[PDB]
Predict the 3D structure of the following.
Amino acid sequence: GSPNSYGDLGGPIITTQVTIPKDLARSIIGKGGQRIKQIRHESGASIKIDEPLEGSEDRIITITGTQDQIQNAQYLLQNSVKQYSGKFF
């Protein structure tokens, strides 16, 4: 109860940004995002995607949550890449 009183919530909140090539960016996001939404509930982490910067074939992602929630998310991002026809074409 009262998720805001001493305990430092295990630790302060941290934010980190990731850059993925546009080609792998589409494999990770999926068509309906069904992939970024699921990872959001499985990791418990929050993620915000920024629009691509005109003049760059890359997409940037921002992860926000506890270090562990972020690591669990960063690892699910690196493994989603294999969705690139890697796991079962």
Remarks:
- Residues 67-81 form the longest helix (15 residues).
- Residues 13 and 49 are 18 Å apart (CA to CA).
